[PDB]
C-alpha cells in the first residue's frame, strides 16, 4: 500500500539485481529523499542507501541506488549469500509525511540444498508427573526453508496433538523449524517407540525415541 | 559509540496508553519512530529533533501519537493512546543525523533493538519450564545436546540465557511456535563437551517479564 | 568455619527447675546467634534471635545472654512441654553453623504402666506371618524389662521393642515389644503371655491369651 | 498465615540424585532469601547453602560445593534443592527455611539477618539400593479405659503418617517410631486408648498412609467377638 | 516418506531369542525384497548378517534368520550370546538410486555379571612438569554396568575445577571403559602430601592415590 | 584375501572438497560408499560399478558427490565438495557382490576400516606425548597424548611389535576444544630392565611423529 515493491526479486551470485520502487510525482518523482533499508529477519533494519544514491560509511559497494522518473532501483552487483534479506524503500511523501514500501525478499538462488539437522527430545520426567507430556523435534540447519513433518506411533502415524513452526531463516542463511507433540502420560508409555520424520526436497531423516523405565 | 537503547518490552489491554523510551549515546540530531507489524512491513510514525523541539506525526496517528523527550536524561518517549489490536507491532528508534550537521537525510543510519507491545484482551498466562535431557543418542559425539523447553506462555516474548548468560557457545533458541490454544511454546537448546557433562552444572533461565516470571532449570541427563 | 559447642549434650530436670544451656563460639560474633528447639518429629522452632530477643510467641519463661564468644539460654521454669533438643546457630560469618544439640528430658515421679496384649489379626494370619503386640502405656522412668512366653517357654531372638519419645504432657512413656512367629510355629503352641518388670511395679505383671479366644 | 509444605520423600540408589521441593504460601515469594538446613537421623542440623528467590543467586557450602544445586520458579512460588552423588551420610532429612528480609544500618551497612523464623515439614531421603514396598495394615483389637491400635508392618523406605478418624482424634495417641526388621523392611505401630463405654458408640478408623508407595489404607477397628 | 522405524533398545536373555523389527512403507520394504542387516560393534565396522529378505552369508551363524511380514522386516537372534550386544541396522530398496538405512536397535544381553572397576592412576611426568604443566591420569577398565562417577580428592578435600571425564565406552570383552584427567600446576602437585583418585560404582568405591618423588 | 583398503585421516576447512579412496583387493563388483556420523547411525551415500562405468547418489548429495574410479590402479575415489559441520563422520567402502554375478543384493558384505573426516574451522594443533612410569609382579606402562586436534591419532608400541596387552583409551573433547589420549599396556616387572619399551604417536593431520621410552624415575 502507498508504495508498489515487487514483492519477490530473486538473483544469482555475481549477477546483479534490480529491486524497484514505484511512486508518484509527489512522494518519489518530486524529490530526492529516498532511501533503502535490509532487513534479515528477527534483526531491526539497517541503512543502505540515503538520499537515492549516498552509500553511508561501511555499506559495500555492490549496493548502489539509483533513480528514473517515478521509480527509485537499487542495484546489488556482488551477489553473496548474505544478501538474503528484506529490502524496503522509504520517501518523502510531503511535510510530516514519509511512506515506506512493502518490502522485497531479495532470494540468492545459487546455494547448495542444506539436509536438516533432526533432535527428538522425550518428555521429562518434570512434565510426566505433571500428568502431561510432550515430544520435541527440533530441525535446523536445511535449505530451502521447506520441511513436511510426520509423528508415528510405532509405525502409525499421529495427527491429532501436533503443534509445527513455520521455518525461519538462521543466522547462518540456513532455515530452522520446530514441532511439538503434546501427549498423555498414558499414550507414551504404551506404545514401543515414538518417530519424528522430517521430509526435505525428497529425502527423509527419522528420529526416533522410547521410554525409559 | 553511538548507538540508541531501547527499553521495554511491554504488554497492554486495548484502550490503554503505551510508553516506549529511547536512550542516545553518543551524538544525535534527530529520532524518529518506526514500526513493524508482525509479518508486516515497516510504517513511519514521528520524529522528533530535542535540539529545536519540532515533532512529526503521521496522518493516521493524529490524536494518539506523543513524541516527548528530556534532555537531563537524554532520553526520548512515545506514546500510543486508544490501543487497538492493529497496533501489535515492534517500535523501533531511528537517528536522523549527527549531533551536528542539522540537516535531515530521511535515511535513519542506526536503530535500536525491537520493542515489542502486545496489544491484547486475552489475560497473560506465564510459561512452564521443563528440562530436555541429554542422551547416548545425543553425547555420544564427543558433543552432547541440552535442552529446555518453555511450554504454554502468553505473550511473546521470553528471555532464555544459559548459567546466567556465561554460556553461549552452540546456543540455538528456537521460535515459538502459535498452539491451537493461542499460547506460545519454544525450546533453547545448547551444545557442550560430553566431558563436562559430570563436572559442570549446566542451568537455563527463562524470563518472561509479561508475567513476572523467572524459572531456573537444571538439565541432567537421566538415570 | 565457625564451630559452636553446647554444654551439655544431655540433661534431665525436674518440673519447675530452671535450666541452663551454654554455646560457646570459636571465634567472636557480638550478638549473631540464634537458639532453636526442635522437638522430636517436628521441624526446628526458632525460640531466640540477636541471642538475647525473645522470638514473637514465646512464653515469658525463656531468655537469652551472652556475647564474644560465650552464650546463654535459660528457662525460668521447666515445662512439661518444654521437652525437645535445643541447638544453637551462628550468622556472624558464612558458613553458618549449628550446635551438637542438648536433649532435654524431665525428672518425673515413678509411674507405673498400663500393660495390653493384642493376638495377631486374623487377615495377617491369611499371609503366613503373625504377630504378637504387647503395649506398656504411660510409664516411668524409661527402663522396663520385658519377656514373651510362648507355653511359659521363654522366646528370644524374635521380638522387636520401640519406644516412644517422652509425652509432652505427662512426661512418661511407651513401648511397643512386636513377636513376630510363623502360622505354623504360631499354631504350635497355645498360651501367649508377655512379662512385664518395671521400678513402679511390685510384682512382674502378666498379660496372657489362649490361641483362638 | 505462613506456609512452606516440602515434597514427599523419596528413596534413591546410592550415586543418584534427589530433587526436594519447597513451595511457600501465604507471603510475597519473591522478597526473601531461602535457605536449605539437612539433618541425618540422630545427628545435628547442618547447613547447606541460600538462594536468592528474585534473581537465583546461589550461595552454596563448601561440603556440598558441586554436589547441590538450587533452582527457583517463581510463577508456582517453589524452590527446588538437587543433590547429587549420594552417599550413606546422605540419608538425612531436607528442611528448607525462610529467615526475614535483610536491612540497611543508619551507616549504611548492609546487616544480614539470617535466622529462621518458618520452616518446612521436612523431607526425607533414603539412600538405598533397597526396593520399595508397600505397607500391610492390620488392627489389633482389644478385649474402665481401653486400647487399640493399628500395625504397619512390611514397609520401605520411611516414613508412615498415621491419623486417627480422619485426624479427629489426638487425645491419647502413640505412633511408635517404626522398627527395621530383620528382612530389610520396616513396621509400627500405633495405639490409642480410649473409654470402653465408646466402644460401642464410636467406630474408631485408622488412616494409614505411605507416600513412596502411593498406599492409602482406612481400616476400622472393631472389637473380635468371641 | 519412505524411512525406516527400528525401536531403538531391544534386549534379551541368553538362550532366549530376541526380535528386531524395521518398519517401513509399501515403496520401500513393502514392495521388494532387497532388505539387509549389519551387526556394529562399538568401535568397529559393520558386517554383513542378512542379504535379502531372509538370506545368511557365508559365515554368519544360522541363529541369525531374517523374515519380512506386509511392511515390516524382523530379524531373528536364536541362541542369544554375550558376543551379539551391539547395534543392528536394517537397511532396504527405496527405489532406483535410493538406500535408506534404520535408526539401529542396540540389542543388550541380560546375562550380567557385574564387575569391580581396575583403576590405575598415573601421576605427571618429569617432561611435562619441567614445561610447567601437570596431568593427573585415572584409567578405569573392566567394570560393568558402564555407570561410575569419578571424584578428586586433595589430600581429603574435593577438587572439581580443571577434571576432565570421558564418558564410559564399551570395550571389546563387553565391558565398559572410561578415563579422568585432572590438569593442575607444578605448584599444586607438589604442595599437597598426596592426590587420590576415587570411583564409585553401584554402592562401591576405590581408591587410588598418588605423592610426589625427590631426592 | 578380499579386503578392502581405505586411505585417508583427512581434515578439511567447511566449504572444501575431499577426497576418499577405496583400493580393492580380490574380485569386486561394486563398491559402495557409507557414511556415519559419531554416535548417530548409518546413512547411504552412493554406489560405483567401474566395470559398467555407472554412479549413484543420495537425493540429499545431489551435485556434491562425485564417485570416479581408476581400473589401471584398480581404486575407487569419492569426492564430497561444500562440507559443513554436518559432513564430519567415519566413511566406509563396502563391497557389492563378487568378480561374477553381475547382479546387487544391496548387501554390503566386507567394510573397509574407518576413514575419518572432520570438518572445522579451527586450526590442528598437534600432540604433547609425554610418559606414564610405573610404580610399584604386572606393571602398567603408558603414554599421554595431550592437546591436540583433531582426531585421530595413532599410537603403536615398539613400531607395532608390542600389541599383547596394549588398551589405547578413547580421547577425551575438553573444554579448551582439544582432545587428549592414554595408551596403556600390561607388560611383566621382570621385563622393566631387560626389554625397551618405545611407544610412536602419529598424528597426521599435522604430521607430528613422536617416540618416547617409558620407564620407571630415578633418584
Known amino acids: 500500500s502507498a508504495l508498489t515493491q515487487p514483492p519477490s526479486a530473486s538473483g544469482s551470485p555475481g549477477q546483479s539485481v534490480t529491486i524497484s520502487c514505484?511512486?508518484?510525482?509527489?512522494?518519489?518523482?518530486?524529490?530526492?529523499?529516498?532511501?533503502?533499508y535490509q532487513q534479515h529477519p528477527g534483526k531491526a533494519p539497517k541503512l543502505?542507501?540515503?538520499?537515492?544514491?549516498?552509500?553511508?560509511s561501511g555499506v559495500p559497494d555492490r549496493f548502489s541506488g539509483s533513480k528514473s522518473g517515478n521509480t527509485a532501483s537499487l542495484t546489488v552487483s556482488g551477489l553473496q549469500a548474505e544478501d538474503e534479506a528484506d529490502?524496503?524503500?522509504?520517501?518523502?511523501?510531503?511535510?510530516?509525511?514519509?511512506?515506506?514500501?512493502?518490502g522485497t525478499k531479495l532470494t540468492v538462488l545459487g546455494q547448495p540444498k542444506a539436509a536438516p539437522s533432526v533432535t527428538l527430545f522425550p518428555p521429562s520426567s518434570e512434565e510426566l508427573q505433571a500428568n502431561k507430556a510432550t515430544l520435541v523435534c527440533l530441525i535446523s540447519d536445511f535449505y530451502p526453508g521447506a520441511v513436511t513433518v510426520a509423528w508415528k506411533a510405532d509405525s502409525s502415524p499421529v495427527k491429532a496433538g501436533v503443534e509445527t513452526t513455520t521455518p525461519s531463516k538462521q543466522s547462518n542463511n540456513k532455515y530452522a523449524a520446530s514441532s511439538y507433540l503434546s501427549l498423555t502420560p498414558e499414550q507414551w508409555k504404551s506404545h514401543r517407540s515414538y518417530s519424528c520424520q522430517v521430509t526435505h526436497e525428497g529425502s527423509t531423516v527419522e528420529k526416533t525415541v522410547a521410554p525409559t523405565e | 559509540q553511538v548507538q540508541l537503547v531501547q527499553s521495554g518490552a511491554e504488554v497492554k489491554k486495548p484502550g490503554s496508553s503505551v510508553k516506549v523510551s529511547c536512550?542516545?549515546?553518543?551524538?544525535?540530531?534527530?529520532?524518529?519512530?518506526v514500526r513493524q507489524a508482525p509479518g508486516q512491513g515497516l510504517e513511519w510514525?514521528?520524529?522528533?529533533?530535542?535540539?529545536?523541539?519540532?515533532?512529526?506525526?503521521?496522518q493516521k496517528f493524529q490524536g494518539r501519537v506523543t513524541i516527548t523527550a528530556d534532555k537531563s536524561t537524554g532520553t526520548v518517549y512515545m506514546e500510543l493512546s486508544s490501543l487497538r489490536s492493529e497496533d501489535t507491532a515492534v517500535?523501533?528508534?531511528?537517528?536522523?543525523?549527527?549531533?551536528?550537521?542539522?540537516?535531515?537525510?530521511?535515511?535513519?543510519?542506526?536503530?535500536?533493538?525491537g520493542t515489542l507491545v502486545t496489544v491484547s484482551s486475552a489475560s497473560t498466562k506465564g510459561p512452564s519450564v521443563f528440562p530436555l535431557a541429554p542422551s547416548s543418542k545425543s553425547t555420544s559425539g564427543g558433543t552432547a545436546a541440552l535442552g529446555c523447553l518453555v511450554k504454554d506462555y502468553f505473550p511473546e516474548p521470553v528471555t532464555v540465557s544459559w548459567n546466567s548468560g556465561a554460556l553461549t557457545s552452540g546456543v540455538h533458541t528456537f521460535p515459538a511456535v502459535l498452539q491451537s490454544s493461542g499460547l506460545y511454546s519454544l525450546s533453547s537448546v545448547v551444545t557442550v563437551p560430553s566431558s563436562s557433562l559430570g563436572t559442570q552444572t549446566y542451568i537455563c533461565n527463562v524470563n518472561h517479564k509479561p508475567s513476572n516470571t523467572k524459572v531456573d532449570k537444571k538439565v541432567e541427563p537421566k538415570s | 568455619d565457625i564451630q559452636l559447642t553446647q554444654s551439655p549434650s544431655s540433661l534431665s530436670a525436674s518440673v519447675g527447675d530452671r535450666v541452663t544451656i551454654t554455646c560457646q563460639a570459636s571465634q567472636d560474633i557480638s550478638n549473631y546467634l540464634n537458639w532453636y528447639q526442635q522437638r522430636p518429629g517436628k521441624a526446628p522452632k526458632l525460640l531466640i534471635y540477636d541471642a538475647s530477643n525473645l522470638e514473637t510467641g514465646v512464653p515469658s519463661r525463656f531468655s537469652g545472654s551472652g556475647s564474644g564468644t560465650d552464650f546463654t539460654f535459660t528457662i525460668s521454669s521447666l515445662q512439661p512441654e518444654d521437652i525437645a533438643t535445643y541447638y544453637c546457630q551462628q550468622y556472624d560469618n558464612p558458613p553458618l553453623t549449628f550446635g551438637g544439640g542438648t536433649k532435654l528430658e524431665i525428672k518425673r515421679t515413678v509411674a507405673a504402666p498400663s500393660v495390653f496384649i493384642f493376638p495377631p489379626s486374623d487377615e495377617q494370619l491369611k499371609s503366613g506371618t503373625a504377630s504378637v503386640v504387647c503395649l506398656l502405656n504411660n510409664f516411668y522412668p524409661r527402663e522396663a524389662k520385658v519377656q514373651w512366653k510362648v507355653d511359659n517357654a521363654l522366646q528370644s531372638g524374635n521380638s522387636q521393642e520401640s519406644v516412644t519419645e517422652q509425652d509432652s504432657k505427662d512426661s512418661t512413656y511407651s513401648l511397643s515389644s512386636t513377636l513376630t512367629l510363623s502360622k505354623a510355629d504360631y499354631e504350635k503352641h497355645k498360651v501367649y503371655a508377655c512379662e512385664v518388670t518395671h521400678q513402679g511395679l511390685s510384682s512382674p505383671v502378666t498379660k496372657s491369651f489362649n490361641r483362638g479366644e | 498465615?505462613?506456609?512452606?509444605?516440602?515434597?514427599?520423600?523419596?528413596?534413591?540408589?546410592?550415586?543418584?540424585?534427589?530433587?526436594?521441593?519447597?513451595?511457600?504460601?501465604?507471603?510475597?515469594?519473591?522478597?526473601?532469601?531461602?535457605?536449605?538446613?539437612?539433618?541425618?537421623?540422630?545427628?545435628?542440623?547442618?547447613?547447606?547453602?541460600?538462594?536468592?528467590?528474585?534473581?537465583?543467586?546461589?550461595?552454596?557450602?563448601?561440603?556440598?560445593?558441586?554436589?547441590?544445586?538450587?533452582?527457583?520458579?517463581?510463577?508456582?512460588?517453589?524452590?527446588?534443592?538437587?543433590?547429587?552423588?549420594?552417599?550413606?551420610?546422605?540419608?538425612?532429612?531436607?528442611?528448607?527455611?525462610?529467615?526475614?528480609?535483610?536491612?540497611?544500618?543508619?551507616?549504611?551497612?548492609?546487616?544480614?539477618?539470617?535466622?529462621?523464623?518458618?520452616?518446612?515439614?521436612?523431607?526425607?531421603?533414603?539412600?538405598?539400593?533397597?526396593?520399595?514396598?508397600?505397607?500391610?495394615?492390620?488392627?489389633?483389637?482389644?478385649?474402665?479405659?481401653?486400647?487399640?491400635?493399628?500395625?504397619?508392618?512390611?514397609?520401605?523406605?520411611?516414613?508412615?503418617?498415621?491419623?486417627?478418624?480422619?485426624?479427629?482424634?489426638?487425645?491419647?495417641?502413640?505412633?511408635?517410631?517404626?522398627?527395621?526388621?530383620?528382612?530389610?523392611?520396616?513396621?509400627?505401630?500405633?495405639?490409642?486408648?480410649?473409654?470402653?463405654?465408646?466402644?460401642?458408640?464410636?467406630?474408631?478408623?485408622?488412616?494409614?498412609?505411605?507416600?513412596?508407595?502411593?498406599?492409602?489404607?482406612?481400616?476400622?477397628?472393631?472389637?473380635?467377638?468371641? | 516418506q519412505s524411512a525406516l522405524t527400528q525401536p531403538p533398545s531391544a534386549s534379551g536373555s541368553p538362550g532366549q531369542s530376541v526380535t528386531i523389527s524395521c518398519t517401513g512403507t509399501?515403496?520401500?520394504?513393502?514392495?521388494?525384497?532387497?532388505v539387509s542387516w549389519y551387526q556394529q560393534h562399538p568401535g568397529k565396522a559393520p558386517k554383513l548378517m542378512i542379504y535379502?529378505?531372509?538370506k545368511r552369508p557365508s559365515g554368519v551363524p544360522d541363529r541369525f534368520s531374517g523374515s519380512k511380514s506386509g511392511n515390516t522386516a524382523s530379524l531373528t537372534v536364536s541362541g542369544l550370546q554375550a558376543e551379539d550386544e551391539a547395534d543392528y541396522y536394517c537397511?532396504?530398496?527405496?527405489?532406483?538410486?535410493?538406500?535408506?538405512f534404520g535408526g539401529g536397535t542396540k540389542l543388550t544381553v541380560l546375562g550380567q555379571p557385574k564387575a569391580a572397576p581396575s583403576v590405575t592412576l598415573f601421576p605427571p611426568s618429569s617432561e611435562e612438569l619441567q614445561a610447567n604443566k601437570a596431568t593427573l591420569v585415572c584409567l578405569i577398565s573392566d567394570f560393568y554396568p558402564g555407570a561410575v562417577t569419578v571424584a578428586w580428592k586433595a589430600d581429603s578435600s574435593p577438587v572439581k575445577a580443571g577434571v576432565e571425564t570421558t564418558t564410559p565406552s564399551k570395550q571389546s570383552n563387553n565391558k565398559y571403559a572410561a578415563s579422568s584427567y585432572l590438569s593442575l600446576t607444578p605448584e599444586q602437585w607438589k604442595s599437597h602430601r598426596s592426590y587420590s583418585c576415587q570411583v564409585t560404582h553401584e554402592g562401591s568405591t576405590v581408591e587410588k592415590t598418588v605423592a610426589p618423588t625427590e631426592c | 584375501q578380499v579386503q578392502l583398503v581405505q586411505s585417508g585421516a583427512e581434515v578439511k576447512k567447511p566449504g572444501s572438497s575431499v577426497k576418499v579412496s577405496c583400493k580393492a583387493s580380490?574380485?569386486?563388483?561394486?563398491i559402495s560408499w557409507v557414511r556415519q556420523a559419531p554416535g548417530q547411525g548409518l546413512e547411504w551415500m552412493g554406489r560405483?560399478?567401474?566395470?559398467?562405468?555407472?554412479?549413484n547418489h543420495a537425493q540429499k548429495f545431489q551435485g556434491r558427490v562425485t564417485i570416479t574410479a581408476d581400473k589401471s590402479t584398480g581404486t575407487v575415489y569419492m569426492e564430497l565438495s561444500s562440507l559443513r559441520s554436518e559432513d564430519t563422520a567415519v566413511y566406509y567402502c563396502?563391497?557389492?557382490?563378487?568378480?561374477?554375478?553381475?547382479?546387487?543384493?544391496?548387501?554390503?558384505?566386507?567394510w573397509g576400516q574407518g576413514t575419518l573426516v572432520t570438518v572445522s574451522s579451527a586450526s590442528t594443533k598437534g600432540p604433547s606425548v609425554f610418559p606414564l612410569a610405573p610404580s610399584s609382579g604386572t606393571a602398567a606402562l603408558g603414554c599421554l597424548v595431550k592437546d591436540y586436534f583433531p582426531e585421530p591419532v595413532t599410537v603403536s608400541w615398539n613400531s607395532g611389535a608390542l600389541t599383547s596387552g596394549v588398551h589405547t583409551f578413547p580421547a577425551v573433547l575438553q573444554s579448551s576444544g582439544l582432545y587428549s589420549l592414554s595408551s596403556v599396556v600390561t607388560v611383566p616387572s621382570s621385563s622393566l630392565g631387560t626389554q625397551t619399551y618405545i611407544c610412536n604417536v602419529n598424528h597426521k593431520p599435522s604430521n607430528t611423529k613422536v617416540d618416547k621410552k617409558v620407564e620407571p624415575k630415578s633418584c
Open positions: 563396502a563391497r557389492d557382490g563378487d568378480s561374477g554375478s553381475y547382479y546387487e543384493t544391496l548387501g554390503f558384505d566386507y
Open positions: 580380490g574380485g569386486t563388483f561394486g
Open positions: 560405483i560399478i567401474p566395470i559398467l562405468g555407472t554412479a
Open positions: 509399501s515403496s520401500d520394504v513393502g514392495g521388494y525384497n532387497y
Open positions: 535379502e529378505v531372509n
Open positions: 537397511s532396504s530398496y527405496a527405489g532406483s538410486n535410493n538406500l535408506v
